């Protein structure tokens, strides 16, 4: 169950110069597409797209590299082998660990401001700790869906393999009104609904 | 077009961190190579147990990238990039419930180069404990982002600051939190 690499091709305020590399594998419908990027500072100057089948000088700073690598069938055939080699291999390692990692969302409904139940207020649905990022967060007022006045922060990555989202509705609560936040996610077998009663 | 994006991202530069080799699955970092310790560090224990990564792969890629850096310092006639200042956001991991342990996240985003100083402040005082951090995480725009963490217990008579330092900043930037 080992991770495989592709060796980047060899080329050739305080003082600082940076070189960045990117080896991206895009898995879709049993296929793999590979993108090798050579970036000087923030300038991607030369790249290899498996869909192109050859190196291309993204900027003119990569013209010597595009020229040289494309003149070398050994380097071209090695880079072309990447989608079916390391991309495929690495993708096929990850069983229900990364490809099927599921973390259930924790849901909390709380109004933004405290006070009398008649005025303008924001009702917050703080959906937390889920994985993957794809989530559906709906707002309901007395069983009917509220589409208008829904202020969303959009998907927030916590950088710890969990996400969060704050979906809030602009509400003018009347006494006895039932506000329901409904979350749908792959980790959930049924929707998770959290209620707020007007008070 | 992709169901998933598995990517190896690496950088090499003159200032600290002098290099970084990492692997990310769907924008989240799975593992990286501690270049000094010459060993793989996994993000979650369940990764280290399920998989392996020979750290030599990381070191080999960094050596090539250092060669590539040198060639480009020359080719570009020592072109140093503009220092892109960071956008800093502070937000809790969990909803704030006074008395219940939570984690404060500091997201230092959209900066270049990956040369940064970050400190957590509780009531204007430096916090040394319950602190963790991400690597200099890659962005599709070849800029960087980083996450700093602080385990804290929310109390109304406490405030927090994320004091960040970057070259693109005229002075340290403090992002305040409740």
């Amino acid at each position: 169950q080992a991770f495989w690499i592709d060796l980047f091709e060899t080329i050739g305020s305080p003082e600082n110069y940076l070189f960045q590399g990117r080896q991206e594998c895009y898995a879709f419908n049993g296929t793999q597409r590979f993108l090798e990027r050579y970036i000087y500072n923030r300038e991607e100057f030369v790249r290899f797209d498996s869909d192109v089948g050859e190196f291309r000088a993204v900027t003119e700073l990569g013209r010597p590299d595009e020229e040289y690598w494309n003149s070398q069938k050994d380097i071209l055939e090695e880079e072309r082998a990447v989608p079916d080699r390391m991309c495929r291999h690495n993708y096929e390692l990850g069983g229900p660990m990364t490809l099927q990692r599921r973390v259930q969302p924790r849901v909390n409904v709380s109004p933004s401001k405290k006070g009398p139940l008649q005025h303008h207020n924001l009702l917050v649905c703080h959906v937390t700790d889920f994985y993957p990022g794809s989530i559906q967060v709906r707002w309901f007022l007395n069983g009917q869906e509220e589409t208008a006045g829904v202020v969303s922060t959009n998907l927030i990555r916590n950088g710890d393999w969990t996400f969060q989202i704050l979906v809030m509705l602009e509400m003018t609560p009347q006494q006895g009104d039932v506000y329901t936040c409904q979350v749908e996610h792959t980790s959930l077998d049924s929707p998770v609904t959290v209620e707020w009663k007007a008070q | 077009k992709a169901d998933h994006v598995s990517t190896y991202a690496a950088f090499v530069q003159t200032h600290r961190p002098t290099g970084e080799f990492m692997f990310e699955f769907d924008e989240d970092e799975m593992f990286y190579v501690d270049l000094d310790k010459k060993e793989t560090v996994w993000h979650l224990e369940e990764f280290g147990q399920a998989f392996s990564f020979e750290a030599q792969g990381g070191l080999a890629n960094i050596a090539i990238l250092n060669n590539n850096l040198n060639t480009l310092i020359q080719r570009s006639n020592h072109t140093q990039a503009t220092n892109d200042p960071p956008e800093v956001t502070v937000f809790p991991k969990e909803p704030v419930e006074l008395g219940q342990p939570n984690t404060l996240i500091c997201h230092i985003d959209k900066f270049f180069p990956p040369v940064l100083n970050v400190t957590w402040l509780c009531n204007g005082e430096l916090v040394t404990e319950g602190v963790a951090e991400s690597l200099f995480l890659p962005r599709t725009d070849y800029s960087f982002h980083k996450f700093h963490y602080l385990t804290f217990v929310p109390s109304a008579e406490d405030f927090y600051d994320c004091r960040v330092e970057h070259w693109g900043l005229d002075q340290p930037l403090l992002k305040h939190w409740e």
Partner: T-cell receptor, first 112, second 114 residues
Framework: GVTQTPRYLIKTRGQQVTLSCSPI?????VSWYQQTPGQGLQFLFE???????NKGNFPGRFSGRQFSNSRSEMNVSTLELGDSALYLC????????????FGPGTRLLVLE | NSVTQMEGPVTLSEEAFLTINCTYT??????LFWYVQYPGEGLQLLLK?????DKGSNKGFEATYRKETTSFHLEKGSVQVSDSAVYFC??????????????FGKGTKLSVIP
């Protein structure tokens, strides 16, 4: 392209040999093989950027090195009669080292 | 992880049909090769195939990467006297740090009789 020196060698059991390899410009992957009628092609070791990436199953007396210019040298100490073989050297431009370019070899004969 | 190829020294008349059998047994992703060793020199790449169904073609020789039979059988329609050499079948498997190691079969000598 791939050059190997010396072309032919006669040694007595117990002596030592150093075999040089000049890979093609600018191949950095250098592999060494022992060719025998008895065992065929037997992998010795492979070098890339001075480091020994892989090693075959040969005793410690069979050692190798690679210089900054990618040239390689292999050494066989405490020579045995059974070390008599063709010491092939192969370079590769592709850094993975699959597409190999073989040298003419060093024909080594070990005698009593 | 081995390469099993056609035994002993094959001897054929000029213009004959050649088949040098080669079967592999390896860890899911190998690339397949045919190396040729002409009398007196070192090996030389003749043909290669990356993935299953890929065909290697050079000097009128052809071998198909066949996953079904796990084989890379070398074929030539009409052999030339110049083809007298020793043919090696080979595997390419990942050997760490983005490197690959060749695994050769025990060579097949071919004598083409004019």
């Amino acid at each position: 392209g791939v050059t190997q020196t010396p072309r032919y060698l006669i040694k007595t059991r117990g002596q030592q040999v150093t075999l040089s390899c000049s890979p093609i410009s600018g191949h950095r992957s250098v592999s060494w093989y022992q060719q025998t009628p008895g065992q065929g092609l037997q992998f010795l070791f492979e070098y890339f950027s001075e480091t020994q990436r892989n090693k075959g199953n040969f005793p410690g007396r069979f050692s190798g090195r690679q210089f900054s210019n990618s040239r390689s040298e292999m050494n066989v100490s405490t020579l045995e009669l059974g070390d008599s073989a063709l010491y092939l050297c192969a370079s590769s431009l592709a850094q993975g080292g699959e597409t190999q370019y073989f040298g003419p070899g060093t024909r080594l004969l070990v005698l009593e | 992880n081995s390469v099993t190829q056609m035994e002993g020294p094959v001897t054929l008349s000029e213009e004959a049909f050649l088949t040098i059998n080669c079967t592999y047994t390896a860890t899911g992703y190998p690339s397949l090769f045919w190396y040729v060793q002409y009398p007196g020199e070192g090996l030389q790449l003749l043909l290669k195939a990356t993935k299953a169904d890929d065909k290697g073609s050079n000097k009128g020789f052809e071998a198909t990467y066949r996953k079904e039979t796990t084989s890379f059988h070398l074929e030539k329609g009409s052999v030339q006297v110049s083809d007298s050499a020793v043919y090696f079948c080979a595997l390419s498997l990942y050997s760490g740090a983005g490197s690959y190691q060749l695994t050769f079969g025990k060579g097949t000598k071919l004598s083409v009789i004019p």
